[PDB]
Amino acid sequence: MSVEEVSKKFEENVSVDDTTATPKTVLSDSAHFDVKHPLNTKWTLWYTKPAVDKSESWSDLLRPVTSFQTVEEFWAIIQNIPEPHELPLKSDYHVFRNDVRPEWEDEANAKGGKWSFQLRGKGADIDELWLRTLLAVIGETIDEDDSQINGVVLSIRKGGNKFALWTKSEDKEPLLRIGGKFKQVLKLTDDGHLEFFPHSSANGRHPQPSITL
Numbered sequence: 746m747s748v749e750e751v752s753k754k755f756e757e758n759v760s761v762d763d764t765t766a767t768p769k770t771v772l773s774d775s776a777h778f779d780v781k782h783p784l785n786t787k788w789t790l791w792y793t794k795p796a797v798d799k800s801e802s803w804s805d806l807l808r809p810v811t812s813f814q815t816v817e818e819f820w821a822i823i824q825n826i827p828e829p830h831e832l833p834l835k836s837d838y839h840v841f842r843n844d845v846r847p848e849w850e851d852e853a854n855a856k857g858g859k860w861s862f863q864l865r866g867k868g869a870d871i872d873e874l875w876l877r878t879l880l881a882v883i884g885e886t887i888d889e890d891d892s893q894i895n896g897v898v899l900s901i902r903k904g905g906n907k908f909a910l911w912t913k914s915e916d917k918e919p920l921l922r923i924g925g926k927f928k929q930v931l932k933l934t935d936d937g938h939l940e941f942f943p944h945s946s947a948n949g950r951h952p953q954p955s956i957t958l
């Protein structure tokens with residue numbers, strides 16, 4: 746049947762009196778201190794190889810997979826080093842979960858924006874350094890980025906690599922600042938080429954995005 750005592754314990758007023766609940770905790774556990782593979786966030790791994798969506802479906806190509814809180818897995822997609830000008834270009838990798846993670850169609854819905862960077866000059870080893878910065882930004886206890894952002898993405902094209910950074914809402918202010926740096930990490934210079942667009946682009950780009958080098 747349904748039976749419940751009648752005592753109730755309402756006596757935990759500690760708004761500004763420090764957490765006196767020292768000996769009384771719900772879970773005194775905090776491993777953390779990893780940085781050896783497992784970071785501290787959840788991020789799925791959806792990468793797109795083909796592009797037959799023309800007749801198939803952008804969702805029929807994109808392969809959603811590896812969803813962990815470490816770096817070994819993400820490093821795996823890089824282990825193939827197909828991004829640094831090693832694959833059939835037109836590539837598109839995506840990993841995230843912090844605040845959103847539905848897809849470029851809603852990852853912007855996350856309430857952040859989509860920073861892209863179209864590279865032309867070939868370096869043969871640029872997608873490895875820019876990735877270590879994206880895959881690490883997810884968490885890697887880096888702070889100052891794995892919390893204000895929501896997810897990242899990567900995509901190559903005919904002689905035109907293109908990466909994507911999906912913020913969670915940090916505001917374009919800190920983006921025009923980050924994008925600027927992330928724009929150089931690509932090791933470019935021909936014209937600081939790059940693209941700045943808020944979710945408003947993946948859902949009705951009525952207003953203006955940000956810029957496009």
Ligand SMILES: C[n+]1cn([C@@H]2O[C@H](COP(=O)(O)OP(=O)(O)O)[C@@H](O)[C@H]2O)c2nc(N)[nH]c(=O)c21
Pocket residue numbers: 796798803835836837848849850851900901902
């Ligand atoms: C990431 N993403 C890409 N596409 C489509 O895939 C096409 C890619 O064409 P593109 O802009 O030349 O990039 P790519 O060929 O290197 O991928 C675009 O026209 C997009 O509309 C997508 N379409 C949907 N619905 N959702 C997504 O998340 C998504």
